[PDB]
Structure 1
């Protein structure tokens, strides 16, 4: 789909209220072409239209949109155009989408019963109605969350800096010969897959309306600190737990594959619903074909069955993610599946993968590009590499 979007025969420019459609066809007039346009706020359609495309080869057609909606509710207006072929051809059926494009229209910024903290030598417990939160004071992570008496976590929520290596990360390197310049080889040499978290700080403070949990960890490999993560957890009286993450990366360590969180949820749900770029798997350097919208796919659709297993299924630019009873909000990238990154790393064939007990969620503030110029040398461009020393992302869990 990325190849399709980059190779499409219609280019689009947005000037104020006017869409300019340029034809890249050299010989044919757009005689089986129809432009559909939609405006949505957060995946909620507000306006929709249709004009017959009448553009000469290598020509232009200016399209005046009607008086567009001016909503007062907060959110980002999105304009999406599509080229749909009404009729059938020898190689396509009726309704075939051949080109598309999305723009951001005017944004409206958002202008708008106490959790009880219990302290023990081993844990930090926060209770708010039927919701409970457990923070292990030895690991410094949220070990468990309760809704009623049902566990929500199989694995604690922990920082993740690695991914199951892609074929581009491996790049010709093998256990026998080894290419020291490959990304996976540099990560293994630096000890990113073997880095151990050391609890630097863990303190809980009860504010006037919320419980504040401040944690700090250092990931070190053989007397060398690679990453430091300082986190804040704020559980308010509305049941929302906002997580603020600040991560420092040593300049002399190789750039990490991701700065995010990973956990194994105890629940398997049939549908994955999210507001963001989709509906297909997309990555920071392969997301032009993805459109911002509200997407609803089964959990199986969120996993890409690559024959050689690796990190897959990531969705970038996601503002809201819903999986069963859990909602995650912010600006993040995520992948969700029944396989863990460790299992994908250790398995060489996709038919040898087994679904695990729950669902593995990988929510990331920042993700490295996947490359693709070649698969024998590193090919991720520098602007897609997590080369900044310090990173920050926020997240809401409710």
Structure 2
């Protein structure tokens, strides 16, 4: 039920600090009465206008290891360039990133999408410390992809030519992403060290305006 799981809200609180506002949340993703994942977050918005997001995720040991642990949203903005400090310039994944180099990369948005004839998750860049897109900057230690296509559309579309650019820009920012495998393509081939099996995961991001 990973694709069908619904987020039940466990906690949502707001506190005013000396120089900041703190929002704390907790969600449980459940399927047929089974809790798959728990996500606990804090959002700290300070006087500098920066939003620090801390995320702690619990994954049930008896659920299949998830494809990713991250956040996503559809941004209103469509910008021409994507600028990042991390592994690149090309698409790279945890078990396919040796060729990628750590540097400051700057590509047109279209280059952040890989046009596989059969559409799927694509265009991830790993080991990224800073991402810039229009007025937005995200900082941390994350993997990301960014494109005009939602994960839902990619999942529901059989051929690349049938894809349509959606309104705005879909951003996926992952603390953690599963390996892609490939020893063969007809049996599970992601090696143990690239499966998300740790049970508890932590990541942190800062969102601000540049």
Stretches (4+) displaced over 6 A: none
In 2, Cα distance between equivalents of 1:389 and 1:297: 35
1:393 matches 2:203: yes
1:354 matches 2:160: no
1:289 matches 2:99: yes
Please state how far the C-alpha of 1:392 moved relative to its aligned partner. Answer: 0.3
* 1:303-340 deviation digits (Å, cap 9, x = unpaired): 00000000000000000000000000000000000000
Please state how far the C-alpha of 1:224 moved relative to its aligned partner. Answer: 0.2
2:86 aligned to which of 254, 269, 276: 276
Q: TM (normalized to structure 2)?
A: 0.99
Secondary structure of the residue that 1:376 maps to in structure 2?
Answer: coil
Please state how far the C-alpha of 1:356 moved relative to its aligned partner. Answer: 0.1
2:43 aligned to which of 216, 233, 241: 233
Please state how far the C-alpha of 1:372 moved relative to its aligned partner. Answer: 0.6
Secondary structure of the residue that 1:301 maps to in structure 2?
Answer: helix
> How many aligned residue pairs are there?
208
* 1:199-221 deviation digits (Å, cap 9, x = unpaired): 00000000111100000000000
Please state how far the C-alpha of 1:229 moved relative to its aligned partner. Answer: 0.1
Computing the radius of gyration from Cα coordinates, the structure with the larger value is 1
Higher relative contact order (CA 8 A, sep 6+): 2
Please state how far the C-alpha of 1:237 moved relative to its aligned partner. Answer: 0.4
Please state how far the C-alpha of 1:249 moved relative to its aligned partner. Answer: 0.2
Structure 1 alignment gaps of length 5 or more: 1-190
In 1, Cα distance between equivalents of 2:56 and 2:34: 19
State the match for 2:63 in structure 1: 253
Please state how far the C-alpha of 1:197 moved relative to its aligned partner. Answer: 0.3
Q: Please report the RMSD computed on the Cα atoms of aligned residues, expressed in angstroms.
A: 0.3
Please state how far the C-alpha of 1:269 moved relative to its aligned partner. Answer: 0.1
In 1, Cα distance between equivalents of 2:143 and 2:21: 27
Secondary structure of the residue that 1:388 maps to in structure 2?
Answer: coil
